[PDB]
Amino acid sequence: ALDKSIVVNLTSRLFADELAALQSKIGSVLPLGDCHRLQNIQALGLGCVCSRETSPDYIQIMQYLSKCTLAVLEEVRPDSLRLTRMDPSDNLQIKNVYAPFFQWDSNTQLAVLPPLFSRKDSTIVLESNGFDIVFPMVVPQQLGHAILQQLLVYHIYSKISALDLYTTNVSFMGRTYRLDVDNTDPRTALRVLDDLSMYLCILSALVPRGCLRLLTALVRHDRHPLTEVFEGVVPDEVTRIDLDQLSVPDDITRMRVMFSYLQSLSSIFNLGPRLHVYAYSAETLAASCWYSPR
C-alpha cells in the first residue's frame, strides 16, 4: 500500500527556545504547499497568506485552506521537522493540543479554521531562519459555523460605521470569546457578502404567504421558547404581505424554489475540509478519524 511522510530540510540549527514550543505541540495539524517528501520550511507555514506586515483577511486565509494538502507532525528533531500526511480517505490518529481548549468525545465532528482568537498564541516565530509558522485551529462544526457567522456579521457592521460587544463576540453554551480583529482586509470578506445580497433578496421575492400568515397567528399570543426574537410584537412588514388570499398550488411552486436555493447556501457557508471522528480517547487526547475533502 501507500506511504505518506514529509521530512522537512532546514538550513539552520534551531535554538532551545523554539524547540520547546514545537515539542509541546507535537501532534498538530498544519497545511503545506507541495506533495513531496523533501520540502522547504517556507511552505509549512500558513504564514504565506497570513503575515505580520500585510493585513490578513481571514476569509481569504480560509479560502486558501481548502486548496492545500494538510499534515500532522511526528517528530521535531533539532535540524529537520518530520511530518505525516493526510489523504482521502484514510483513518489517522489526531491529537488536539489546541490552546482555546474544547472537549470532544466519540462520534464527534470537526473542521479546520484559521487562528481567530489569539494570533500571538497560535503563531510561533522562528528568528533562526526568519520565517514564521502559523498553526491553524480545528473546531467542531457547531462552533466551526458560529465563528464564520459572527465574522460575516462583523464586516456588515464595520462598513455601516463609515460597538464591539455585539459584533466581535462568539457565543456558546457556557463560554464567550473574542474574535481577533485589529487589521483585517474586508474586501475578500465582502465578495462573500456581495453574493449574500444576491441570494437573500431572491429569497425575499418567493416568500410563501401561508408561512407569513402562520406567524401572524403565532407570535401574537401563542408564545414559544424559540420565537423570543420578535419579543411579542409583529414586524411592520409581515402585516403588509398577507393581504392576498391563500391558495395551495401557488405556494407549491414557491416552496420548491425556496427548497432549491437553500441548497445553494451550502456554497457560501462552506467550512474547509471536514473530519469525521469515530473514536476519541479522553485522558490521552488522541482520536481516530477519516479525512474527507469537500
Binding site: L2, D3, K4, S5, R37
Partner: protein
C-alpha cells in the same frame, strides 16, 4: 539645467569562471543507507522514491577551502542608461489634481519585445 545636480548608481553582473582549491581531509563524511519508498500509486503508473542521508563535519578550525575569480566569460548587465521608474514602485502616491497627474505620467512614462545589446539595467538618481 535645474537647480540641482545628481549622482547615478548602477549594477553590473559578470559571468565568471572560478578556481576552488580545497585542502586535503578537511571534511569528514558520513554515508547512510539508501531505501526505496513507494507512494502516489495511480492507475497508469506507480511512483517510487530513493532517498539517502548524509552527515558532514568540518575537521579543522581554520579555513580549508578558498574560491577565486579567475576568468571573465561574459557581461550580462549591458551597462545600460535605463533609469528606474518610481511610478512602478510607489503606485499609491499621486498628485492632488487627478487631471494633472495623468499629464506628468504621460510626459515621462513587458513593453520591450526585444533587446539588442543585453539585459537591461536600472539606474537611480540621488
Amino acid at each position: 539645467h535645474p537647480g540641482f545636480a545628481m549622482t547615478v548608481v548602477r549594477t553590473d553582473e559578470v559571468l565568471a569562471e572560478h578556481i576552488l582549491y580545497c585542502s586535503r581531509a578537511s571534511t569528514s563524511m558520513f554515508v547512510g543507507l539508501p531505501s526505496v519508498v513507494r507512494r502516489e500509486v495511480r492507475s497508469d503508473a506507480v511512483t517510487f522514491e530513493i532517498t539517502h542521508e548524509i552527515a558532514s563535519l568540518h575537521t579543522a578550525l581554520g579555513y580549508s577551502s578558498v574560491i577565486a575569480p579567475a576568468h571573465v566569460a561574459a557581461i550580462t548587465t549591458d551597462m545600460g542608461v535605463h533609469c528606474q521608474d518610481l511610478f512602478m514602485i510607489f503606485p499609491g502616491d499621486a498628485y492632488q489634481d487627478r487631471q494633472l497627474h495623468d499629464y506628468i505620467k504621460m510626459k515621462a512614462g513587458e513593453n520591450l519585445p526585444g533587446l539588442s545589446h543585453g539585459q537591461l539595467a536600472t539606474c537611480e538618481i540621488i
